[PDB]
Symmetry: C2
């Protein structure tokens, strides 16, 4: 351990400003209408700072800033843009404790996740895409002796990006790094629940970017987010969040015939076949861990393994390993590295999950662990903490069908491979899934039989760069965290060149 | 010279059936409601045959067939699917004369276009995509010693495709070849203006595919096309046609969160710099051809170069070579190989273009050639023929801005390169462009300066496989005629496999 002092107290690593503006054209400026909202820490509900309640007039200032710099930025050489993303990565590493403490206070999640996952993965994402842009190549092929097709990657120009609250800085990196590597200017709209981290990041890296290349407008999704999603001045929209707003985003994109990438929600089935109980005892632990991992980021993960599928024959013996670890979760101060499960992100998310616990009970869901509030002492009492919940039921329940987006896992049993496949795909989502078995053939079949974008095999919650992350079905369109991302933030210009100086006989 | 006899006459290569059904589950079937519309030849206005006026009940029957065959088809090995497409291509070559005459009779375009471009290019698309599926590879990268990322291309399953009338069979190949190569079953809705070609193609090639793999539903866009475009049972929609309907496809696709690709319309600028007048006499002539090439397929091409941009200094001398060819256009029987410009596709198309000529005169657009009907003798009088029109005006006119989709070219002058590029990009479209210059550096600048998906340089109207074809701006989303499409007809399955046992210390 290490127990970081609360921000702005003696020994604190960071003290936040009382008021933050938007970042437009290389500067922090007030909103046009001078309107502000108050943000609060979910760790304890105490005030943090105010941030602009920006209106459509602020989007257009950033769009003016982005467009002015678009021509020069898209022209900056591959080497130079890459080096800039390398400089951003270093800046992220150098301030690991400051960034993680800011994220944890803003988001509420345990600090040990921000130190070991969010911030290091964020730095690497800039490292990864700076690297991939040096290797990217267009194509040149001979159609014949006198006809050559050339394909040249070109940036789209100005792109709108809206990121959610459950990984504010890491979701920013998921989108800023490839779009910037591709030579685009960005208008970025952070979640009104978690605006603080991006501001602190911009204070650290702003000088590394040309003016107007990265503009960040704070505000609300139905104000700033709406003005951004319908902007006729963006060449592409990108959105991560809840399915109803995504469906709308794709409609906003449809009206203007612009590319769109949307990553939405999921109901991830975590599948444990019977042979795992016959593996080494250490493997058994990793699998039981892989189920408790559903409480990672307090279950506020779009690929949260919120559906546990365990084969009947091993269910009695396996859950006994799972429950040993569920009871071992240390709760408490999120700035305490020992705390394994932090606060829910907001009061709205906290209340939404509590309504879902009650809904589980009316459908006969048997409570196996948790199921209510966790009343932590001290300043924590005003925070938003819920107990890790393990529920046993059947896939046809509402709690097995709808994304809760909290530390709640449904458990059910299955008989054979075919039914395991049937329960896994009997969802409208298809973002993630877990699969635990040692039969090489079973691992492959289920791996391809499941209709999910990612199948973690004998692990869970690994989000490395260089692995495509995206949804089937209603889970979304497009892939992230992989070099294929670059094709989403660029268009292919085909130069079809004839070197013959005579006509083709049509005249 | 050679004059193919009209279908059903002595010596004709083809005699059409009086009534055709849909093709579903390996059979030709009537519509459920037994309702038919009459198809007529645009060469002469005379009836051809009756075709199903299919309703949503016909859309859903074919979707029932596609899903039944979806699992077995998607599992067929790369080798087997490839070989099947090679046999389809051969079947098209073996019947080159028969199908091309069908195209000409159904669509109206000159036979020499169906013989020398459309039909061979369709055959090559199947040869091309059979080839690209043999080369396709997923990815395999080690994230570390015990973490390996796999990406596996997987077919989307059942896909809807809707094609227009201006290249009935060739647009069929543009969509059928990659989707079938990718392992999808297809429900295809052809333009009710040109239903005949698909049927004749299916009578020749249907047997090569398992029942329910290729299903074609004939009907009207707002009836059958609507039922298909809004189907909950397709994993992707694919559509080529008019821009307002494209946005709607993108709306309906948004409703169900499915990937979408749309080719839309264009107003393609053909730019002629002054140095061409200093090249060899053969180059000059090829350039004059490239402007007259706008009358290819009667100007009924989404990338038709209907906007000619000529540098002021050479305008008088260049246009006289261009005018030399415009006057030399042979007209007559579309089945006459010597006939260079055929009939418009429909009566609505014939009158829609005439409405734009009326508008052109009232806007001060100066007539340099054509401008009225093409009054052909014999039975051709009941056909739909319009004169090749060269108009002089300025880019701000309506005829220079809006898609006419006919044998109409606007001609304008410019002073310098900067003005040439500015006029080139003063359009809402971005499908195609032409560029004529011998300065290697000027060719590159404008080549990347134009905001169109394709810039033909010192050529025009080459549509080879292995060259990306797709739109900027309101011209569309996605690319065609290139192997990069396969990712539009497949989904990436990421298997993230850990080979380390024991737990990772979390939870």
């Amino acid at each position: 351990s290490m127990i970081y002092a609360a921000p702005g107290t003696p020994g604190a690593v960071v003290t936040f400003k009382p008021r933050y503006g938007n970042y437009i054209g290389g500067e922090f400026v007030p909103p046009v209408k001078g309107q502000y909202f108050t943000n609060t820490s979910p760790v304890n509900g105490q005030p943090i700072a105010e941030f602009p309640r920006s209106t459509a007039e602020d989007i257009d200032k950033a769009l003016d800033a982005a467009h002015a710099a678009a021509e020069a930025w898209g022209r900056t050489s591959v080497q130079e843009r890459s080096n800039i993303l390398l400089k951003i990565a270093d800046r992220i590493e150098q301030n690991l404790e400051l960034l993680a403490v800011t994220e944890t206070w803003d988001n509420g999640k345990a600090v040990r996740e921000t130190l070991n996952a969010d911030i290091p993965l964020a730095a690497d994402h800039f490292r990864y895409f700076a690297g991939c842009i040096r290797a990217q190549e267009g194509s040149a092929a001979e159609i014949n002796d006198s006809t050559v097709a050339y394909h040249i990657h070109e940036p789209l120009g100005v792109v709108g990006q809206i990121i959610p609250w459950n990984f504010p800085l890491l979701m920013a990196a998921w989108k800023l790094a490839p779009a910037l590597a591709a030579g685009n200017c960005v208008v970025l709209k952070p979640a009104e629940q978690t605006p603080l981290g991006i501001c602190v990041l911009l204070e650290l890296i702003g000088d590394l970017l040309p003016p107007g290349v990265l503009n960040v407008v704070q505000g609300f999704g139905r104000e700033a987010g709406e003005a951004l999603a319908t902007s006729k001045r963006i060449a592409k929209i990108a959105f991560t969040g809840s399915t109803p707003v995504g469906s709308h985003i794709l409609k906003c994109a449809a009206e203007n015939i612009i590319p769109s990438t949307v990553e939405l929600g999921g109901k991830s089935p975590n599948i444990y076949f019977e042979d795992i109980m016959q593996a080494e005892p250490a493997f058994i632990e990793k699998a039981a861990e892989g189920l408790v991992l559903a409480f990672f980021n307090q279950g506020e993960v779009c690929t949260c393994p919120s559906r546990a599928l365990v084969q009947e024959s091993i269910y009695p013996a396996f859950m006994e390993e799972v429950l040993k670890k569920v009871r071992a979760i240390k709760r408490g101060d999120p700035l305490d590295t020992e705390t394994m499960v932090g606060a829910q992100a907001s009061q709205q998310q906290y209340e939404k999950i509590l309504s879902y616990l009650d809904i589980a009970q009316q459908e006969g869901a048997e409570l196996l662990a948790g199921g209510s509030v966790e009343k932590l002492e001290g300043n924590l009492a005003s925070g938003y903490y819920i107990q890790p919940t393990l529920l046993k039921g059947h896939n046809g329940m509402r709690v097995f069908q709808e994304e809760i987006f909290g530390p709640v896992v449904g458990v059910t049993t299955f008989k054979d491979e075919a039914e395991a496949l049937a329960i896994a795909n009997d969802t409208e989502y298809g973002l993630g899934a877990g699969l635990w078995t040692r039969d090489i053939n079973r691992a492959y079949r289920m791996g391809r039989g499941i209709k999910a974008g990612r199948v973690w095999t004998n692990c869970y919650h690994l989000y490395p760069a260089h692995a495509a992350f995206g949804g089937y079905k209603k889970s979304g369109v497009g892939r992230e965290t992989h070099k294929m991302m670059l094709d989403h933030y660029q268009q292919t210009k085909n130069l079809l060149v004839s070197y013959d100086i005579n006509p083709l006989g049509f005249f």
